[PDB]
RNA sequence: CACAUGUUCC
RNA sequence: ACGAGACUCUGGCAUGCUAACUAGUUACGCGACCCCGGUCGGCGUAACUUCUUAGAGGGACAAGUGGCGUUCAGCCACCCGAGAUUGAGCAAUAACAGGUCUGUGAUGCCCUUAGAUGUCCGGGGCUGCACGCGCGCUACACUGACUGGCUCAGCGUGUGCCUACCCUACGCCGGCAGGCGCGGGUAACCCGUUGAACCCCAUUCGUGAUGGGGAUCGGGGAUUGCAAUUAUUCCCCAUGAACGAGGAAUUCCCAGUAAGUGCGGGUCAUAAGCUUGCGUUGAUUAAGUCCCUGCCCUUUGUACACACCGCCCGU
């Protein structure tokens, strides 16, 4: 029956999204941290709020969490989302071209190409699902 | 004696537990030894905290019945302690062994219940619950309006139950309940 | 009875209230007894804070047709000084201080002086 | 007709009209291979053996 | 397996 | 946004902190008594806060592990642990022709207002009894009754602005109820170390409407009050009835819980079978279900809307 409400959870994310380095993993450690970085009115809530923080710390060390704004993971996500491989996914030497979309270029301007070799046609129209 | 225990003067050892179906629900030896059949309590809070209780304390916990005698464990231990000698001065053997054959032989196997009745099997903990119960109310009428005291009736029945001699209340009500279940089975 | 009940509901918002529950019971416009209810803003009902966050006043008015009941209920605002309301904060509000803007060091330097 | 040692090895669910019975996937200490389903009364634990007065009665899965 | 009915100024 | 939660008071653990000649202990030193030791709420002293008490704090979070779960919300299990759900209070939106005009100097309106439905004095009634019903109490016995002995509590209250009326120790007188003389307590002080019952031990009875039961009723004696006859209560003796475990039916309850057992509070001049709290003895059973009784969401059906206790058809 021990299910936390919003004020246990909406507050604990503010503990993480602003104070990540000032905490650790153990409960009584960041229990003693959260008393000075957050004015919690009661003692039982003081054990309540920090208790959800350590449980979410057991998730951040293990994976990414949705409602979290941590400065060190997003820069890690930044460097993988500005990523550029030294070769492109377009710089290919063998551009396999279908026999019909060969024909469409012959009427257009770029009709005769160099690095474009042609395949063989698939025999027998069989492409949609059997009904039932 | 920090090695062995004497239940007043009764030895802890040499009680073979006959049935293997109830031996996981008879706490009577080498982990469950007490000088008294009386602890502070605490056994009746959890679901299966009733499984490791000493059986002689369980009977006293079920003996304080019918109003006026509820909340009087000080005297029901004064009944069974007197009643343990009564078994010994009739048998000569361990009186607690007689209790082992008593709870084994007075627990009904199959029991009808409201489902039209479907006769179904029972739990060993249900079985030790009923076997200790049916004798505990059987002697409750044997001393009722009779010169035979409650100490003897408590001792007389499990003597008649360890042999299944069918002159005790607990044996009769076990086989009738096994038979009326055998009707709608 | 409508115009006057706003006259106290607005008089506290110029005075800086947190919320109010004004209810005018009694008979109005006929023989039948009814109840007016103009609630607005934040206003709590439960908890120990009801003693020191809400100040309750109930009065009666004498007229020719009946006796009307008024519950002038006001939720006090909060102040850490404690001169407009209670000193104690809410049981659920979590005052979290902002992190101070410190620039992380990359160089090991000493500042011996004296 | 035999007294048989049938070891309760897992519980399925509470049954009956008032929820006074529970159904168990019971197994036999007397031979491991055959195993049936049968309602039990009273509080049930895991790994206890039962005493079947008859062995051919099987309960239906609710 | 059975289990019908209603009193109403407001 | 409210309600739930949070919150409050209490319950449990901290030989750490703060201190107690109206709280207790530890010693030391005599007195008494038995064979250096033993005991004592006998008597003083300096060190202490263990017990006394209550102030601050500290302690528990699903915290750690192991399963389980989107591996999210969470759940089951283990260990460490004084606690791995103490109990209550507070408690919304809307609603009822719920109840109170017998709580009022809260009141609209109405009746009455001197031969008064106002006020006071006397006495009676509210207690009255063929009968039905509700909450209760003591019982129906031998796990008992009866008689000695032994021994354990925790909640409270006490001298009244009026108020002339308190809680009570001690010392006597009397079988008892009760009575008389001193002393203290406006209270952690005196009562009071609150010597409670149940209990425990040991008699006696012996399945008998008996020594279970104490209804009814006669006789005597004291208290309170101006006044007790329709017996205010109370003690003594004698009387000793129904009642042999309670049909149909139905109530309350899952942990110090039910029940047993007493003790204070309220009413109180006289006064608890009621009620409100307290401690004491201490469980059986259960860790489940929608069967019943209802209750909360979702769909669906509705000829219902004072709403199925609805509506309505034919003779």
Swiss-Prot record, chain A:
Entry GO terms, CC: cytosolic ribosome; nucleolus; ribonucleoprotein complex
Sites bearing Phosphothreonine, chain numbering: 129
Keyword Ubl conjugation applies: yes
Post-translational modification: Ubiquitinated at Lys-102 by RNF14 and RNF25 in response to ribosome collisions (ribosome stalling).
Alphabetized SUPFAM superfamilies for the sequence: Rps17e-like
Keyword presence, Signal: no
Molecular-function annotations in GO: structural constituent of ribosome
UniProt-listed InterPro entries: Ribosomal_eS17, Ribosomal_eS17_CS, Ribosomal_eS17_sf
In-chain residues carrying the UniProt-annotated modification Phosphoserine: 112
N6-succinyllysine modifications at: 18
Pfam families xref list: Ribosomal_S17e
Compartment(s) where it occurs, according to its Swiss-Prot or TrEMBL record: Cytoplasm; Nucleus, Nucleolus
Superkingdom assignment: Eukaryota
Position(s), cross-link Glycyl lysine isopeptide (Lys-Gly) (interchain with G-Cter in SUMO2): 102
GO biological process per UniProt: translation
Covalent crosslink: Glycyl lysine isopeptide (Lys-Gly) (interchain with G-Cter in SUMO1): 102
UniProt keyword list: Cytoplasm, Isopeptide bond, Nucleus, Phosphoprotein, Ribonucleoprotein, Ribosomal protein, Ubl conjugation
PANTHER family listed in its UniProt record: 40S RIBOSOMAL PROTEIN S17
NCBIfam families: PRK01151.1
Family label: Belongs to the eukaryotic ribosomal protein eS17 family.
Function field: Component of the small ribosomal subunit. The ribosome is a large ribonucleoprotein complex responsible for the synthesis of proteins in the cell. Part of the small subunit (SSU) processome, first precursor of the small eukaryotic ribosomal subunit. During the assembly of the SSU processome in the nucleolus, many ribosome biogenesis factors, an RNA chaperone and ribosomal proteins associate with the nascent pre-rRNA and work in concert to generate RNA folding, modifications, rearrangements and cleavage as well as targeted degradation of pre-ribosomal RNA by the RNA exosome.
Protein name per Swiss-Prot or TrEMBL: Small ribosomal subunit protein eS17
Source organism per UniProt: Oryctolagus cuniculus (Rabbit)
Gene: RPS17
From Swiss-Prot, chain B:
CDD domains associated with the record: uS7_Eukaryote (cd14867)
Phosphoserine PTM positions: 123
Cross-link (Glycyl lysine isopeptide (Lys-Gly) (interchain with G-Cter in SUMO2)): 34
GO annotation terms (biological process): translation
Keyword Ribonucleoprotein: yes
Matches recorded under InterPro entries: Ribosomal_uS7, Ribosomal_uS7_CS, Ribosomal_uS7_dom, Ribosomal_uS7_dom_sf, Ribosomal_uS7_euk/arc
An annotated GO cellular component: small ribosomal subunit
Domain of life, source organism: Eukaryota
Gene Ontology MF annotations: RNA binding; structural constituent of ribosome
Keyword Acetylation applies: yes
Principal subcellular localisation of the protein: cytoplasm
Protein localization: Cytoplasm; Nucleus, Nucleolus
Residue numbers bearing the N6-acetyllysine modification: 34
Phosphothreonine, modified sites: 1
Record keywords, A-Z: Acetylation, Cytoplasm, Isopeptide bond, Nucleus, Phosphoprotein, Ribonucleoprotein, Ribosomal protein, Ubl conjugation
Coiled-coil regions listed: none
Function: Component of the small ribosomal subunit. The ribosome is a large ribonucleoprotein complex responsible for the synthesis of proteins in the cell. Part of the small subunit (SSU) processome, first precursor of the small eukaryotic ribosomal subunit. During the assembly of the SSU processome in the nucleolus, many ribosome biogenesis factors, an RNA chaperone and ribosomal proteins associate with the nascent pre-rRNA and work in concert to generate RNA folding, modifications, rearrangements and cleavage as well as targeted degradation of pre-ribosomal RNA by the RNA exosome.
Family listed: Belongs to the universal ribosomal protein uS7 family.
Subunit structure as annotated in this protein's UniProt entry: Component of the small ribosomal subunit. Part of the small subunit (SSU) processome, composed of more than 70 proteins and the RNA chaperone small nucleolar RNA (snoRNA) U3.
Protein name: Small ribosomal subunit protein uS7
Gene: RPS5
Swiss-Prot record, chain C:
Cell location: Cytoplasm; Nucleus; Nucleus, Nucleolus; Mitochondrion inner membrane
Cross-link (Glycyl lysine isopeptide (Lys-Gly) (interchain with G-Cter in ubiquitin)): 88, 100
Positions bearing Phosphothreonine: 106-107
Covalent link location (Glycyl lysine isopeptide (Lys-Gly) (interchain with G-Cter in SUMO2)): 100
UniProt region (Disordered), positions on chain: 86-114
Sites of Phosphoserine modification: 95, 110
PTM: Methylation by PRMT1 is required for import into the nucleolus and for ribosome assembly. Sumoylation by SUMO1 enhances protein stability through increased resistance to proteolysis.
Residues recorded as bearing N6-succinyllysine in the entry: 18
Subunit record text: Component of the 40S small ribosomal subunit. Identified in a IGF2BP1-dependent mRNP granule complex containing untranslated mRNAs. Interacts with HNRPD. Interacts with PRMT1; the interaction methylates RPS3. Interacts with SUMO1; the interaction sumoylates RPS3. Interacts with UBC9. Interacts with CDK1; the interaction phosphorylates RPS3. Interacts with PRKCD; the interaction phosphorylates RPS3. Interacts with PKB/AKT; the interaction phosphorylates RPS3.
Family to which this protein belongs: Belongs to the universal ribosomal protein uS3 family.
Record protein name field: Small ribosomal subunit protein uS3
Organism of this sequence: Oryctolagus cuniculus
Native organism taxonomy: Eukaryota, Metazoa, Chordata, Craniata, Vertebrata
UniProtKB/Swiss-Prot annotation, chain D:
InterPro entries found in the cross-reference section: NA-bd_OB-fold (IPR012340), Ribosomal_eS28 (IPR000289), Ribosomal_eS28_CS (IPR028626)
Pfam families found in the cross-reference section: Ribosomal_S28e
SUPFAM superfamilies: Nucleic acid-binding proteins
Top-level taxon of the source organism: Eukaryota
Record PTM Phosphoserine, positions in chain: 35
Subcellular location(s) of the protein: Cytoplasm, Cytosol; Cytoplasm; Rough endoplasmic reticulum; Nucleus, Nucleolus
Gene Ontology MF annotations: structural constituent of ribosome
GO cellular-component term (any): rough endoplasmic reticulum
Gene3D superfamilies given in the database record: Nucleic acid-binding proteins
Gene Ontology biological process terms in this record: cytoplasmic translation; maturation of SSU-rRNA; ribosomal small subunit assembly
UniProt keyword Ribonucleoprotein present: yes
Keyword entries, A-Z: Acetylation, Cytoplasm, Endoplasmic reticulum, Nucleus, Phosphoprotein, Ribonucleoprotein, Ribosomal protein
HAMAP family listed in its UniProt record: Ribosomal_eS28
Record function comment: Component of the small ribosomal subunit. The ribosome is a large ribonucleoprotein complex responsible for the synthesis of proteins in the cell. Part of the small subunit (SSU) processome, first precursor of the small eukaryotic ribosomal subunit. During the assembly of the SSU processome in the nucleolus, many ribosome biogenesis factors, an RNA chaperone and ribosomal proteins associate with the nascent pre-rRNA and work in concert to generate RNA folding, modifications, rearrangements and cleavage as well as targeted degradation of pre-ribosomal RNA by the RNA exosome.
Family as reported in the entry's similarity comment: Belongs to the eukaryotic ribosomal protein eS28 family.
Protein name stated in the entry: Small ribosomal subunit protein eS28
Native organism: Oryctolagus cuniculus (Rabbit)
Gene that encodes the chain: RPS28
């Amino acid at each position: 029956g021990r299910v936390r409400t919003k004020t246990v959870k909406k507050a604990a994310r503010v503990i993480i999204e602003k104070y990540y380095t000032r905490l650790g993993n153990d409960f009584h450690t960041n229990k003693r941290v959260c008393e000075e970085i957050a004015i919690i009115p009661s003692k039982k809530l003081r054990n309540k709020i920090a208790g959800y923080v350590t449980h979410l710390m057991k998730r951040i060390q293990r994976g990414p969490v949705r409602g979290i704004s941590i400065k060190l993971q997003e820069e890690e996500r930044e460097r993988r989302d500005n990523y550029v491989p030294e070769v492109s996914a377009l710089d290919q030497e063998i551009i396999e071209v279908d026999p019909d979309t060969k024909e469409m270029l012959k009427l257009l301007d770029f009709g005769s190409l160099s690095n474009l070799q042609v395949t063989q046609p698939t025999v027998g129209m069989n492409f949609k699902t059997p009904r039932g | 004696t920090p090695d062995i225990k004497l239940f007043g003067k009764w030895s802890t050892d040499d009680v073979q537990i006959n049935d293997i179906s109830l031996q996981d629900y008879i706490a009577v030896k080498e982990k469950y030894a007490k000088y008294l059949p009386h602890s502070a309590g605490r056994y009746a809070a959890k679901r299966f905290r009733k499984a490791q209780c000493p059986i002689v304390e369980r009977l006293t916990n079920s003996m304080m019945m019918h109003g006026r005698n509820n909340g009087k464990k000080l005297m029901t231990v004064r009944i069974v302690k007197h009643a343990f000698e009564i078994i010994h001065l009739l048998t000569g053997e361990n009186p607690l062994q007689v209790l082992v054959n008593a709870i084994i032989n007075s627990g009904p196997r199959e029991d009808s219940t409201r489902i039209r009745r479907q006769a179904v099997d029972v739990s060993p903990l249900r079985r030790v619950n009923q076997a200790i119960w049916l004798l505990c109310t059987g002697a409750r009428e044997a001393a009722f309006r009779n010169i035979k005291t409650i100490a003897e009736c408590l001792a007389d029945e499990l003597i008649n139950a360890a042999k299944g001699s069918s002159n005790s209340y607990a044996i009769k009500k076990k086989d009738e309940l096994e038979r009326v279940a055998k009707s709608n089975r | 009875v409508r115009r006057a009940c706003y006259g106290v509901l607005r008089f506290i918002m110029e005075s800086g209230a947190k919320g109010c529950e004004v209810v005018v019971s009694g008979k109005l416009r006929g023989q039948r007894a009814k109840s007016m209810k103009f609630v607005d803003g934040l206003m709590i009902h439960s908890g120990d804070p009801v003693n020191y966050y809400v100040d309750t006043a109930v009065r009666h008015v004498l007229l020719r047709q009946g006796v009307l009941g008024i519950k002038v209920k006001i939720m006090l605002p909060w102040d850490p000084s404690g001169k407009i309301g209670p000193k104690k904060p809410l049981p659920d509000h979590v005052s979290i201080v902002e992190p101070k803007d410190e620039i992380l060091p990359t160089t090991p330097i000493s500042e011996q002086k004296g | 007709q035999p007294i048989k040692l049938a070891r309760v090895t897992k519980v399925l669910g509470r049954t009956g009209s008032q929820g006074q019975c529970t159904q168990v996937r019971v197994e036999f200490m007397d031979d491991t291979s055959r195993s049936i389903i049968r309602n039990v009364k009273g509080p049930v634990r895991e790994g206890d053996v039962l005493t079947l007065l008859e062995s051919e009665r099987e309960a239906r899965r609710l």
